[PDB]
């Protein structure tokens, strides 16, 4: 496996674009298993109308044609909030786009294609807070054939309470 992107391995040195700016996904710091980790988190489950995007850096494709995308993330149950959040969701959407040039800060939603609606196999509940129990989901998807010089991934939140701890993109050689 040749790894093209690995968020956790950057130990907090890698920053990803967020949209709209200063709303939505935030880079957070915590200690887990006695080591410092970083995660992108969002939890606007009470208010109307969330549409928060997190987009990776542009990733040079090289010779990869088919990529595997492994996510690790926690999601909190919408019934675990005192209010009862009637605008709360428990999924988020995974997207990608290919381009021949990095657009940098010029982020355009419309150029992204949805890969999947992602859901947690194990949801975080109230009693997990007092148990300090981390239910870390793993989901993997693949996309291809790729043909352009690089690509982006993006994550769109629409009112969930989600922390994204790992994003690894890789291809297989033989």
């Amino acid at each position: 496996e040749v790894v093209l992107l690995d968020f956790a391995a950057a130990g907090g040195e890698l920053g990803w674009l967020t949209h709209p700016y200063g709303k939505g996904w935030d880079l957070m710091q915590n200690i887990m298993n006695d080591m410092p980790i970083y995660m992108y988190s969002v939890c606007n489950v009470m208010s109307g109308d969330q549409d928060n995007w997190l987009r990776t850096n542009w990733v040079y494709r090289g010779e990869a044609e088919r990529i595997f995308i492994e996510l690790k993330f926690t999601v909190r149950d919408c019934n675990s909030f005192p209010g009862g959040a009637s605008s709360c969701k428990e999924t988020f959407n995974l997207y990608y786009a290919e381009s021949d040039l990095d657009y940098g800060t010029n982020f355009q939603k419309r150029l992204f294609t949805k890969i999947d609606t992602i859901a947690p196999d194990e949801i975080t509940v109230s009693s997990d807070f007092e148990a300090r129990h981390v239910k870390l989901n793993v989901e993997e998807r693949s996309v291809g054939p790729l043909t352009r010089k690089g690509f982006y991934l993006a994550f769109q939140d629409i009112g969930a309470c989600v922390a994204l701890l790992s994003v690894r993109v890789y291809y297989k050689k033989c």
Partner: protein, 132 residues
């Protein structure tokens, strides 16, 4: 958000009376800035480093963590090339991460440190009050 800068170092006179307090709003951030040194000014052994803990009032009062579970961050990069190591705490009401902290309007919260350049001569601590 409004962000609040706290320089976490023994030379900061704000810590001088053991009662440094800041007042924030929900969803503000507090950027706690670790001690940081330019490449030759100070001897390596004289460079301050801390363990930071986020603790309850009793632990803050004693200036002593009740357990390793309360370790929040470590200031262990005193001469990092990029600049100071920084802990950026968002005072958010909810988290999806069960090891993190939730903050409520009308409540108060506490950080203490223990030194790693450890002759603990002094208590550094901080109280943060969240408004309604």
């Amino acid at each position: 958000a409004d962000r609040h800068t706290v320089f976490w170092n023994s030379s900061n006179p704000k810590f001088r009376n053991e009662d440094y307090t800041i007042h924030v709003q929900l969803n503000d951030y507090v950027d706690i800035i670790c001690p940081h040194y330019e490449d030759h000014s100070v001897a390596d052994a004289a460079m301050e480093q801390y363990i930071l803990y986020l603790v309850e009032h009793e632990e803050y009062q004693l200036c002593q963590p009740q357990s390793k579970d309360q370790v929040r961050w470590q200031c262990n990069r005193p001469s990092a090339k990029h600049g100071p190591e920084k802990l950026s705490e968002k005072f958010q009401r909810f988290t999806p991460f069960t090891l993190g902290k939730e903050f409520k309007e009308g409540h108060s919260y506490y950080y203490i440190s223990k030194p790693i350049h450890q002759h603990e001569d002094r208590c550094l601590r901080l109280k943060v009050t969240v408004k309604i």
